[PDB]
């Protein structure tokens, strides 16, 4: 198992590119590639990538071709570039996963047995993290269903080592907000969660609204998982809580009171100072 | 701009920063910093820095490359 | 095959070796935060440096040697005390088994 | 079945559902927390015994029908006081 | 700038003695200055009608040299051109496709220049659809002029359809002013190029954006474009537009010289020095020939600026509204005229300052 | 001499496994291969061939190469342990074939049938279809145990260019001891 | 503001620009230049700027 | 006789630039060197899209380190994935060195040029563009044989003194002597900046997550604390009022000390943690049951 497949910057701006690359003349699907990377104690470092000659047919959704020699030659010379990159999975720009996805990753898995598929979703750019890892486990599913391929998630997680990074800052340079925050980017972190939770808890409302409907089937697993965030809930509604609130928030306002005498008092030191200052150099005139 | 150029600012005690002596001052925002390297350098002074602390035998921290006051 | 192979395996790890860069051994000598020491190299000047994220903080007591980065600057593994016997102090003398 | 928030059992609930005396639901809660099918705390003064759950269940159509009505009441409220916080804030939020 | 300078100080005087005079130094620059050079000459016989055609041919018979003469030949019959129009479309399409072709459309289009004549926008567009870079940056220009005030929806449409769609950046910077000039003085009628260029993510179209509010908002200032105009230059980050933001103020507010001294007195000390530029250039264009000495006073300390176009800017704007003017009429004519001569005769500055310095002259 | 890539399609089907042909199917589609890979190299040194097997999947073993070499390491450990799919081999093998690195060499396929191929006549016939408007020549052999000439197999070749066409030969080995002689002395040298 | 932001723009570019070094001036040479020892290094005949 | 007019610009595309930077620091200690994929758009532009490591060699960066084995295959290579570029320069890094070539380095830049008459050579120190600010100036060789006409020979044009001014730390390795520098603009577009964005972008999570209390009282009190000793000193520093030419005493006592700088300087921190801090606890209570 993988915990995190840290994505650096590098490779998502490069999918970027191998996707225009394409469709900009012939109009395609998913942009499959190679992802290199180093590996750590279970955490894949996705350093690099390259892309891989890939095509598709809409019949039949198994007439493709994912070249081998390309794979395996540009390896060849990625590998005398830098030695700390070994294959460790494929990347594809088409948001919803393909039926050759399985068939393909057991391909990617005759280079790198624990092959991770880095979904970019190139074309959005939404409420965030483009990066979507995904492995392949075949297990009995204890629970009496029938076995097959499917795609196992991995939490996924955009860094970026030193060099890169002193490049993308500058990269932006332009739209950078300050990583103070200040006032005014706070909150608006803030109506940027709201709305989130919510697209997250709409979500959740069609899926459950499909099991609910019988339009797709019931998990029996995760999905009371979301019954378990259902009980995670504060009800705050309780007396003792109702009180240790209050007592919190009005632990704070007395030090933004005392905090808004402060800048009141000395603003108006600030206009003495200032009225004596131009009614000074009013008299000096004359 | 403020909020970056104090960052930018902030930037300049990145770390790394070579240690020097802090031999003498010329005047304000500048220094004849001698560097652990071996030789004596008149770097700048970061404003931020406070003059009061510049004692005539400081340990300040010099930038690695552009080797100023940091 | 089978001979070819595992020669041209460690060949394989010295490649990668080439590329493998040298670390500026050094001493640390104080600890001004979580985040910065001051280490000397063993010939060398002292620079205010930090520790690799997969570090142990502590770890890096005063007197604990360190091999930081050529670039960066930052240390990136501890290491055992230097011994060698440049000792002046007859405290090596074995009395010897008696 | 409880309410959610009343999260509370009084001790007659419990003993009048399993038909087992009072001085047992004392012990039988004792048990079910021992193995790990709750994660709550008994009281005896009032002898309600405070629950938190951390061991789910299977579902059910009209459990998770009666589970999504639920969270449509959620985002409900989650969107309402988004737009009490853009709206409000709209000069500032920059 | 000496070849530019004289130009203006014998514009429409046909007194050329200064070329004629010094002439083997007119021969030290060679390549695109030949190109001004042989324009120059068409600047100082300004206003020459018929003798021109035989006068262009006589003095400069090269490819720079002769794209020059052709592009000299239209400033002479500028804004009226009449036959001269037809014997440039002729010389324009027989070309060398190079230099030639540049000076060519350039003259063609100052020479039929609100003509909106069909015949020479057919051609242009050809030149410009040629795509050769050095030809689109004056195709653009000539393709603008012909159509100045036009509103012509296939000359927008196609202008601009040709922006997002080619590289080469100059043929972009003609486009940019050459759709600009298309919307002169509707000031209300389009107002959404003004509002679609100005969302376009490529910075030249942005531009050329801005400036479609000053030809298009000429004179009237209104206040709700002066809001529009002011907020680019003040939020916008590619520096270019910011500076074709401030500057592009003085085209609407040139009616009224009296309140543009003020608004930009604060954006000529901003941080970025393009914003600054654009405060002297909106300073010279808004007051046009008036010897405010109010807008003079607040070019007198950029002229000091430690940025050397900044600086530039700021003689060239003084310069620009000191015209005709003695120490009589304003107290600094005489003060600047010796600065210009000490910048001018002073050999440490940039040349960017000492451009602004022969310009001024 | 005539510039074609041959993609060659090996069965290694399960049924492939039973050597009807004297020492087994497979040694005979290895033989085979071992002719018709050579036989192209040899009749123009710029060719090129790979080959797919096309049991269970449609695996791409070995990309286009010229080198002979690779396609034949690559045959060893073929493992004949799947089910044919004929309806998607050849386009797979076609799919892979548009990838021709260069640009000019004609089209030539052979496909190795030594299973019964369970295909809908209406889909082969369209897959025919296809091949006919892109202008891709394929010779199909069949092996060991199978309907003698399938219907829907021999309806493919007629299709596969017809009205004197190139003449892509459905070539039928007679099952029983032959090796591949007979797929050397027809097919490999006249296709 | 502009003009604070000005400072602090302007310190991070004098900033950047390298330290120079301190060296004991021998004795003069001409009328430009300047025999100087550099601390680590040796004799050197420098120049002189024109301020 | 053409001329490279100022204007002239080398486009680096966002990926390149990461690319350039991350090979660079890569074998930082040492130098490396890898050729630039690009079209020359027209005279005035020199386009770079992306650009492909040629391995390191003991060699360094010299024209021997371009194994044309590796770069004939690579090309072919990277033209079936759709990236029919040509080879538009050449870019090695120089480890703190700065952005200038060193002999060796003219006598590979002009076989470049050998080829094409505007293959652009760049640099890229790893070591010294740490921060904000990347260090990568082009380059192209001035022909020797232009000394009798204008060295830089540009024409009408006025950005030749922007985006930078002739760097010191080079000027001496010979410049507008013998290499001069081409300006370099970087070709970031909208769907690039967006998954670059991404690089430190938080979450939907962050920003409901309400601190902890434990540590924010702590900070409260520790603030307000520190806050009270800046009034006693606001207190004495008004107090004083000393009119003994004050407005030189208001620059005869800046140290940036207690008058406002230490005041409301906290005020706003102070105030913003707890503003921030409420109104996430109120969402939460409304939000969350
Ligand atoms: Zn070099």
Request: glycine content about 6%; hydrophobic content about 40%.
């Given at each position: 198992?993988?915990?995190?497949?840290?994505?650096?910057?590098?490779?998502?701006?490069?999918?970027?590119?191998?996707?225009?690359?394409?469709?900009?003349?012939?109009?395609?699907?998913?942009?499959?590639?190679?992802?290199?990377?180093?590996?750590?104690?279970?955490?894949?470092?996705?350093?690099?990538?390259?892309?891989?000659?890939?095509?598709?047919?809409?019949?039949?959704?198994?007439?493709?071709?994912?070249?081998?020699?390309?794979?395996?030659?540009?390896?060849?010379?990625?590998?005398?570039?830098?030695?700390?990159?070994?294959?460790?999975?494929?990347?594809?720009?088409?948001?919803?996963?393909?039926?050759?996805?399985?068939?393909?990753?057991?391909?990617?898995?005759?280079?790198?047995?624990?092959?991770?598929?880095?979904?970019?979703?190139?074309?959005?750019?939404?409420?965030?993290?483009?990066?979507?890892?995904?492995?392949?486990?075949?297990?009995?599913?204890?629970?009496?269903?029938?076995?097959?391929?499917?795609?196992?998630?991995?939490?996924?997680?955009?860094?970026?080592?030193?060099?890169?990074?002193?490049?993308?800052?500058?990269?932006?340079?332009?739209?950078?907000?300050?990583?103070?925050?200040?006032?005014?980017?706070?909150?608006?972190?803030?109506?940027?969660?709201?709305?989130?939770?919510?697209?997250?808890?709409?979500?959740?409302?069609?899926?459950?609204?499909?099991?609910?409907?019988?339009?797709?089937?019931?998990?029996?697993?995760?999905?009371?998982?979301?019954?378990?965030?259902?009980?995670?809930?504060?009800?705050?509604?309780?007396?003792?809580?109702?009180?240790?609130?209050?007592?919190?928030?009005?632990?704070?306002?007395?030090?933004?009171?005392?905090?808004?005498?402060?800048?009141?008092?000395?603003?108006?030191?600030?206009?003495?100072?200032?009225?004596?200052?131009?009614?000074?150099?009013?008299?000096?005139?004359? | 701009?403020?909020?970056?150029?104090?960052?930018?600012?902030?930037?300049?005690?990145?770390?790394?920063?070579?240690?020097?002596?802090?031999?003498?001052?010329?005047?304000?925002?500048?220094?004849?910093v001698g560097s652990t390297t071996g030789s004596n350098y008149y770097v700048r002074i970061l404003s931020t820095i406070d003059r009061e602390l510049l004692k005539p035998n400081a340990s300040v921290a010099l930038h690695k490359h552009s080797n100023?006051?940091? | 095959?089978?001979?070819?192979?595992?020669?041209?395996?460690?060949?394989?790890?010295?490649?990668?070796?080439?590329?493998?860069?040298?670390?500026?051994?050094?001493?640390?000598?104080?600890?001004?935060?979580?985040?910065?020491?001051?280490?000397?190299?063993?010939?060398?000047?002292?620079?205010?440096?930090?520790?690799?994220?997969?570090?142990?903080?502590?770890?890096?007591?005063?007197?604990?040697?360190?091999?930081?980065?050529?670039?960066?600057?930052?240390?990136?593994?501890?290491?055992?005390?230097?011994?060698?016997?440049?000792?002046?102090?007859?405290?090596?003398?074995?009395?010897?088994?008696? | 079945?409880?309410?959610?928030?009343?999260?509370?059992?009084?001790?007659?609930?419990?003993?009048?559902?399993?038909?087992?005396?009072?001085?047992?639901?004392?012990?039988?809660?004792?048990?079910?927390?021992?193995?790990?099918?709750?994660?709550?705390?008994?009281?005896?003064?009032?002898?309600?015994?405070?629950?938190?759950?951390?061991?789910?269940?299977?579902?059910?159509?009209?459990?998770?029908?009666?589970?999504?009505?639920?969270?449509?009441?959620?985002?409900?409220?989650?969107?309402?006081?988004?737009?009490?916080?853009?709206?409000?804030?709209?000069?500032?939020?920059? | 700038?000496?070849?530019?300078?004289?130009?203006?100080?014998?514009?429409?005087?046909?007194?050329?003695?200064?070329?004629?005079?010094?002439?083997?130094?007119?021969?030290?620059?060679?390549?695109?200055?030949?190109?001004?050079?042989?324009?120059?000459?068409?600047?100082?016989?300004?206003?020459?009608?018929?003798?021109?055609?035989?006068?262009?041919?006589?003095?400069?018979?090269?490819?720079?040299?002769?794209?020059?003469?052709?592009?000299?030949?239209?400033?002479?019959?500028?804004?009226?051109?009449?036959?001269?129009?037809?014997?440039?479309?002729?010389?324009?399409?027989?070309?060398?496709?190079?230099?030639?072709?540049?000076?060519?459309?350039?003259?063609?289009?100052?020479?039929?220049?609100?003509?909106?004549?069909?015949?020479?926008?057919?051609?242009?567009?050809?030149?410009?659809?040629?795509?050769?870079?050095?030809?689109?940056?004056?195709?653009?220009?000539?393709?603008?002029?012909?159509?100045?005030?036009?509103?012509?929806?296939?000359?927008?449409?196609?202008?601009?359809?040709?922006?997002?769609?080619?590289?080469?950046?100059?043929?972009?910077?003609?486009?940019?002013?050459?759709?600009?000039?298309?919307?002169?003085?509707?000031?209300?009628?389009?107002?959404?190029?003004?509002?679609?260029?100005?969302?376009?993510?490529?910075?030249?179209?942005?531009?050329?954006?801005?400036?479609?509010?000053?030809?298009?908002?000429?004179?009237?200032?209104?206040?709700?474009?002066?809001?529009?105009?002011?907020?680019?230059?003040?939020?916008?980050?590619?520096?270019?537009?910011?500076?074709?933001?401030?500057?592009?103020?003085?085209?609407?507010?040139?009616?009224?010289?009296?309140?543009?001294?003020?608004?930009?007195?604060?954006?000529?000390?901003?941080?970025?020095?393009?914003?600054?530029?654009?405060?002297?250039?909106?300073?010279?264009?808004?007051?046009?020939?008036?010897?405010?000495?109010?807008?003079?006073?607040?070019?007198?300390?950029?002229?000091?600026?430690?940025?050397?176009?900044?600086?530039?800017?700021?003689?060239?704007?003084?310069?620009?509204?000191?015209?005709?003017?003695?120490?009589?009429?304003?107290?600094?004519?005489?003060?600047?005229?010796?600065?210009?001569?000490?910048?001018?005769?002073?050999?440490?500055?940039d040349v960017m300052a000492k451009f602004g310095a022969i310009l001024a002259q | 001499m005539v510039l074609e890539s041959t993609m060659?399609?090996?069965?290694?089907?399960?049924?492939?496994?039973?050597?009807?042909?004297?020492?087994?199917?497979?040694?005979?589609?290895?033989?085979?291969?071992?002719?018709?890979?050579?036989?192209?190299?040899?009749?123009?040194?710029?060719?090129?061939?790979?080959?797919?097997?096309?049991?269970?999947?449609?695996?791409?073993?070995?990309?286009?190469?010229?080198?002979?070499?690779?396609?034949?390491?690559?045959?060893?450990?073929?493992?004949?342990?799947?089910?044919?799919?004929?309806?998607?081999?050849?386009?797979?093998?076609?799919?892979?074939?548009?990838?021709?690195?260069?640009?000019?060499?004609?089209?030539?396929?052979?496909?190795?049938?030594?299973?019964?191929?369970?295909?809908?006549?209406?889909?082969?016939?369209?897959?025919?279809?296809?091949?006919?408007?892109?202008?891709?020549?394929?010779?199909?052999?069949?092996?060991?145990?199978?309907?003698?000439?399938?219907?829907?197999?021999?309806?493919?070749?007629?299709?596969?260019?017809?009205?004197?066409?190139?003449?892509?030969?459905?070539?039928?080995?007679?099952?029983?001891?032959?090796?591949?002689?007979?797929?050397?002395?027809?097919?490999?040298?006249?296709? | 503001?502009?003009?604070?932001?000005?400072?602090?723009?302007?310190?991070?570019?004098?900033?950047?620009?390298?330290?120079?070094?301190?060296?004991?001036?021998?004795?003069?040479?001409?009328?430009?230049?300047?025999?100087?020892?550099?601390?680590?290094?040796?004799?050197?005949?420098?120049?002189?700027?024109?301020? | 006789?053409?001329?490279?007019?100022?204007?002239?610009?080398?486009?680096?595309?966002?990926?390149?630039?990461?690319?350039?930077?991350?090979?660079?620091?890569?074998?930082?200690?040492?130098?490396?060197?890898?050729?630039?994929?690009?079209?020359?758009?027209?005279?005035?532009?020199?386009?770079?899209?992306?650009?492909?490591?040629?391995?390191?060699?003991?060699?360094?960066?010299?024209?021997?380190?371009?194994?044309?084995?590796?770069?004939?295959?690579?090309?072919?290579?990277?033209?079936?994935?759709?990236?029919?570029?040509?080879?538009?320069?050449?870019?090695?890094?120089?480890?703190?060195?700065?952005?200038?070539?060193?002999?060796?380095?003219?006598?590979?830049?002009?076989?470049?040029?050998?080829?094409?008459?505007?293959?652009?050579?760049?640099?890229?120190?790893?070591?010294?563009?740490?921060?904000?600010?990347?260090?990568?100036?082009?380059?192209?060789?001035?022909?020797?044989?232009?000394?009798?006409?204008?060295?830089?020979?540009?024409?009408?044009?006025?950005?030749?003194?922007?985006?930078?001014?002739?760097?010191?730390?080079?000027?001496?390795?010979?410049?507008?002597?013998?290499?001069?520098?081409?300006?370099?603009?970087?070709?970031?577009?909208?769907?690039?900046?967006?998954?670059?964005?991404?690089?430190?972008?938080?979450?939907?999570?962050?920003?409901?997550?309400?601190?902890?209390?434990?540590?924010?009282?702590?900070?409260?009190?520790?603030?307000?604390?520190?806050?009270?000793?800046?009034?006693?000193?606001?207190?004495?520093?008004?107090?004083?009022?000393?009119?003994?030419?004050?407005?030189?005493?208001?620059?005869?006592?800046?140290?940036?000390?207690?008058?406002?700088?230490?005041?409301?300087?906290?005020?706003?921190?102070?105030?913003?943690?707890?503003?921030?801090?409420?109104?996430?606890?109120?969402?939460?209570?409304?939000?969350?049951?």
């Amino acid at each position: 198992a993988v915990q995190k497949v840290v994505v650096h910057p590098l490779v998502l701006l490069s999918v970027v590119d191998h996707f225009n690359r394409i469709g900009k003349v012939g109009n395609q699907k998913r942009v499959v590639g190679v992802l290199l990377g180093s590996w750590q104690k279970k955490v894949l470092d996705v350093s690099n990538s390259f892309a891989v000659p890939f095509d598709e047919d809409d019949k039949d959704d198994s007439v493709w071709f994912l070249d081998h020699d390309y794979l395996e030659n540009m390896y060849g010379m990625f590998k005398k570039v830098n030695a700390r990159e070994r294959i460790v999975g494929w990347y594809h720009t088409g948001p919803k996963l393909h039926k050759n996805d399985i068939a393909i990753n057991e391909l990617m898995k005759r280079y790198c047995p624990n092959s991770v598929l880095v979904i970019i979703d190139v074309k959005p750019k939404d409420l965030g993290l483009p990066t979507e890892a995904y492995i392949s486990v075949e297990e009995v599913h204890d629970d009496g269903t029938p076995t097959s391929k499917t795609f196992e998630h991995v939490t996924s997680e955009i860094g970026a080592e030193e060099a890169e990074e002193v490049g993308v800052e500058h990269l932006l340079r332009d739209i950078k907000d300050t990583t103070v925050g200040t006032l005014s980017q706070r909150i608006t972190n803030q109506v940027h969660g709201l709305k989130g939770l919510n697209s997250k808890l709409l979500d959740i409302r069609s899926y459950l609204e499909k099991v609910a409907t019988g339009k797709l089937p019931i998990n029996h697993q995760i999905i009371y998982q979301l019954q378990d965030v259902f009980n995670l809930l504060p009800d705050v509604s309780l007396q003792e809580f109702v009180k240790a609130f209050y007592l919190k928030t009005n632990d704070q306002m007395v030090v933004v009171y005392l905090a808004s005498l402060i800048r009141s008092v000395v603003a108006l030191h600030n206009l003495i100072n200032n009225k004596i200052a131009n009614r000074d150099a009013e008299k000096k005139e004359g | 701009e403020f909020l970056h150029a104090q960052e930018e600012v902030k930037r300049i005690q990145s770390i790394p920063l070579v240690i020097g002596q802090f031999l003498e001052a010329v005047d304000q925002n500048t220094a004849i910093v001698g560097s652990t390297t071996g030789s004596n350098y008149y770097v700048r002074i970061l404003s931020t820095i406070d003059r009061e602390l510049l004692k005539p035998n400081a340990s300040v921290a010099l930038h690695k490359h552009s080797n100023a006051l940091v | 095959l089978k001979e070819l192979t595992k020669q041209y395996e460690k060949s394989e790890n010295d490649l990668k070796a080439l590329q493998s860069v040298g670390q500026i051994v050094g001493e640390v000598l104080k600890q001004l935060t979580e985040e910065k020491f001051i280490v000397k190299a063993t010939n060398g000047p002292r620079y205010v440096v930090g520790c690799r994220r997969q570090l142990d903080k502590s770890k890096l007591k005063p007197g604990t040697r360190v091999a930081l980065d050529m670039t960066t600057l930052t240390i990136m593994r501890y290491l055992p005390r230097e011994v060698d016997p440049l000792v002046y102090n007859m405290s090596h003398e074995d009395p010897g088994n008696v | 079945t409880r309410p959610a928030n009343h999260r509370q059992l009084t001790f007659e609930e419990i003993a009048k559902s399993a038909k087992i005396t009072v001085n047992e639901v004392e012990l039988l809660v004792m048990k079910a927390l021992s193995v790990g099918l709750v994660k709550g705390s008994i009281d005896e003064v009032d002898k309600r015994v405070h629950m938190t759950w951390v061991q789910p269940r299977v579902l059910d159509l009209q459990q998770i029908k009666g589970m999504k009505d639920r969270l449509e009441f959620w985002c409900t409220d989650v969107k309402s006081m988004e737009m009490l916080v853009e709206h409000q804030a709209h000069d500032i939020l920059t | 700038a000496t070849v530019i300078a004289n130009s203006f100080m014998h514009c429409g005087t046909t007194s050329d003695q200064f070329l004629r005079d010094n002439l083997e130094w007119l021969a030290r620059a060679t390549n695109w200055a030949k190109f001004t050079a042989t324009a120059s000459l068409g600047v100082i016989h300004k206003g020459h009608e018929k003798e021109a055609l035989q006068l262009m041919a006589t003095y400069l018979p090269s490819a720079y040299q002769e794209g020059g003469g052709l592009y000299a030949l239209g400033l002479i019959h500028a804004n009226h051109g009449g036959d001269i129009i037809d014997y440039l479309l002729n010389q324009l399409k027989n070309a060398s496709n190079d230099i030639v072709r540049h000076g060519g459309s350039l003259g063609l289009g100052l020479a039929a220049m609100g003509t909106a004549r069909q015949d020479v926008y057919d051609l242009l567009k050809t030149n410009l659809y040629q795509d050769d870079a050095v030809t689109g940056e004056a195709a653009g220009l000539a393709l603008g002029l012909v159509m100045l005030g036009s509103k012509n929806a296939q000359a927008i449409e196609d202008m601009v359809g040709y922006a997002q769609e080619t590289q080469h950046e100059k043929i972009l910077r003609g486009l940019a002013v050459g759709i600009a000039l298309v919307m002169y003085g509707r000031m209300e009628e389009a107002d959404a190029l003004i509002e679609s260029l100005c969302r376009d993510k490529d910075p030249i179209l942005r531009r050329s954006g801005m400036y479609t509010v000053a030809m298009a908002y000429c004179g009237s200032g209104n206040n709700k474009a002066i809001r529009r105009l002011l907020h680019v230059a003040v939020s916008d980050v590619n520096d270019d537009v910011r500076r074709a933001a401030v500057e592009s103020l003085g085209f609407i507010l040139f009616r009224t010289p009296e309140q543009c001294p003020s608004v930009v007195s604060l954006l000529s000390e901003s941080y970025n020095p393009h914003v600054r530029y654009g405060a002297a250039m909106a300073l010279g264009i808004c007051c046009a020939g008036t010897g405010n000495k109010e807008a003079i006073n607040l070019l007198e300390p950029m002229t000091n600026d430690p940025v050397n176009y900044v600086r530039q800017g700021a003689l060239i704007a003084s310069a620009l509204i000191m015209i005709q003017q003695t120490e009589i009429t304003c107290p600094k004519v005489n003060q600047f005229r010796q600065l210009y001569s000490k910048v001018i005769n002073d050999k440490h500055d940039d040349v960017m300052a000492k451009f602004g310095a022969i310009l001024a002259q | 001499m005539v510039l074609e890539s041959t993609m060659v399609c090996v069965d290694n089907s399960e049924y492939m496994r039973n050597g009807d042909f004297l020492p087994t199917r497979l040694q005979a589609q290895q033989d085979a291969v071992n002719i018709v890979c050579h036989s192209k190299t040899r009749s123009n040194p710029e060719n090129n061939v790979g080959l797919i097997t096309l049991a269970n999947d449609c695996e791409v073993l070995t990309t286009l190469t010229p080198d002979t070499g690779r396609i034949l390491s690559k045959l060893h450990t073929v493992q004949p342990k799947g089910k044919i799919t004929f309806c998607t081999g050849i386009r797979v093998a076609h799919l892979a074939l548009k990838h021709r690195q260069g640009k000019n060499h004609k089209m030539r396929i052979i496909a190795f049938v030594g299973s019964p191929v369970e295909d809908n006549e209406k889909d082969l016939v369209k897959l025919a279809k296809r091949l006919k408007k892109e202008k891709v020549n394929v010779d199909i052999i069949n092996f060991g145990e199978e309907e003698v000439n399938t219907e829907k197999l021999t309806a493919f070749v007629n299709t596969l260019n017809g009205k004197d066409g190139t003449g892509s030969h459905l070539v039928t080995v007679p099952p029983g001891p032959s090796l591949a002689d007979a797929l050397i002395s027809s097919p490999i040298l006249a296709g | 503001l502009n003009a604070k932001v000005r400072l602090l723009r302007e310190e991070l570019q004098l900033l950047q620009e390298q330290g120079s070094y301190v060296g004991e001036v021998v004795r003069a040479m001409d009328k430009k230049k300047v025999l100087v020892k550099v601390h680590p290094e040796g004799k050197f005949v420098v120049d002189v700027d024109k301020n | 006789a053409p001329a490279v007019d100022t204007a002239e610009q080398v486009y680096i595309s966002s990926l390149a630039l990461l690319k350039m930077l991350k090979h660079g620091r890569a074998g930082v200690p040492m130098e490396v060197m890898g050729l630039m994929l690009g079209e020359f758009v027209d005279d005035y532009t020199v386009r770079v899209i992306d650009v492909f490591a040629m391995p390191q060699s003991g060699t360094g960066v010299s024209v021997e380190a371009v194994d044309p084995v590796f770069q004939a295959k690579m090309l072919d290579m990277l033209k079936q994935t759709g990236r029919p570029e040509m080879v538009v320069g050449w870019y090695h890094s120089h480890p703190g060195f700065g952005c200038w070539l060193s002999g060796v380095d003219i006598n590979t830049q002009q076989s470049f040029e050998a080829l094409s008459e505007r293959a652009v050579a760049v640099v890229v120190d790893p070591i010294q563009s740490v921060k904000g600010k990347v260090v990568i100036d082009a380059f192209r060789l001035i022909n020797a044989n232009m000394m009798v006409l204008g060295h830089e020979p540009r024409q009408t044009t006025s950005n030749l003194g922007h985006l930078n001014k002739p760097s010191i730390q080079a000027l001496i390795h010979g410049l507008n002597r013998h290499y001069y520098s081409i300006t370099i603009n970087y070709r970031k577009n909208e769907l690039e900046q967006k998954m670059l964005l991404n690089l430190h972008k938080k979450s939907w999570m962050e920003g409901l997550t309400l601190q902890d209390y434990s540590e924010h009282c702590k900070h409260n009190e520790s603030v307000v604390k520190e806050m009270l000793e800046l009034a006693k000193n606001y207190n004495k520093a008004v107090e004083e009022e000393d009119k003994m030419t004050p407005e030189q005493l208001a620059i005869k006592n800046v140290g940036k000390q207690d008058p406002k700088r230490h005041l409301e300087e906290h005020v706003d921190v102070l105030m913003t943690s707890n503003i921030v801090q409420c109104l996430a606890a109120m969402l939460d209570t409304v939000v969350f049951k």
